[PDB]
Structure 1
Amino acid sequence: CTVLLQIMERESGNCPKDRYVVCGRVFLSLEDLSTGKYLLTFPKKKPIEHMEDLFALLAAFHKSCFQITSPGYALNSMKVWLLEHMKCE
């Protein structure tokens, strides 16, 4: 596949500037994936040290944003829930 980043301005209502760019080209095959090399297969690839692999999981995944209001307390239990109950790196 070839990869095409398209850019459009919003401020100018002329639609004046519809620049594009060809950002490259991905070759991919079964002889590639049979040797791992691009996959993410969990827990072996626990220690996250190629940041592309973080960016792939922040792409692929079902994202959901929550506000939390504790209106008659302070809210500090989070970090413990994260680090102790959920055992976050």
Structure 2
Amino acid sequence: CTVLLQIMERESGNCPKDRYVVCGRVFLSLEDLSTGKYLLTFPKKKPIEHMEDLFALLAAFHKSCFQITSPGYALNSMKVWLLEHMKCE
């Protein structure tokens, strides 16, 4: 596959600036995947040190965004549950 980044401006109601880029090309096969190389296979690839692997998980996954309001308390147990109960690095 080859990759296209399309750009368009919003401000100008002329549709004037409809640039692109050809941003490279992705070669792939079972010989490559059979040796991992682009996969993420869990727990051995716990220590995330090529950030594309982090970026892959933040692209693939089902994102869900929330507000938490404690209006007659302050809210700090987060970090314990995160760090202690959930055990976050």
Mark yes or no: TM-score above 0.5.
yes
What is the TM-score normalised by the length of structure 2?
Answer: 0.99
Cα displacement (A) at 1:56: 0.1
Cα displacement (A) at 1:42: 0.3
Q: Deviations over 1:28-87 (max 9, x none)?
A: 000000001110000010000000000000000000000000011000010001000000
Aligned-pair Cα RMSD in Å: 0.3
Instruction: Measure, in 1, the Cα distance between the counterparts of 2:11 and 2:85.
Output: 47
4+ long deviations beyond 3 Å: none
Instruction: Measure, in 1, the Cα distance between the counterparts of 2:9 and 2:28.
Output: 33
**Stretches of structure 2 lacking an aligned partner (at least 5 in a row):** none
**Stretches of structure 1 lacking an aligned partner (at least 5 in a row):** none
What is the TM-score normalised by the length of structure 1?
Answer: 0.99
Instruction: Measure, in 2, the Cα distance between the counterparts of 1:13 and 1:28.
Output: 41
Q: Aligned residues: percent identity? A: 100
Cα displacement (A) at 1:21: 0.3
Task: Say which SS state the counterpart of residue 24 (structure 1) adopts.
Answer: strand
Task: Say which SS state the counterpart of residue 38 (structure 2) adopts.
Answer: coil
Provide the aligned length of Structure 1 versus Structure 2.
89
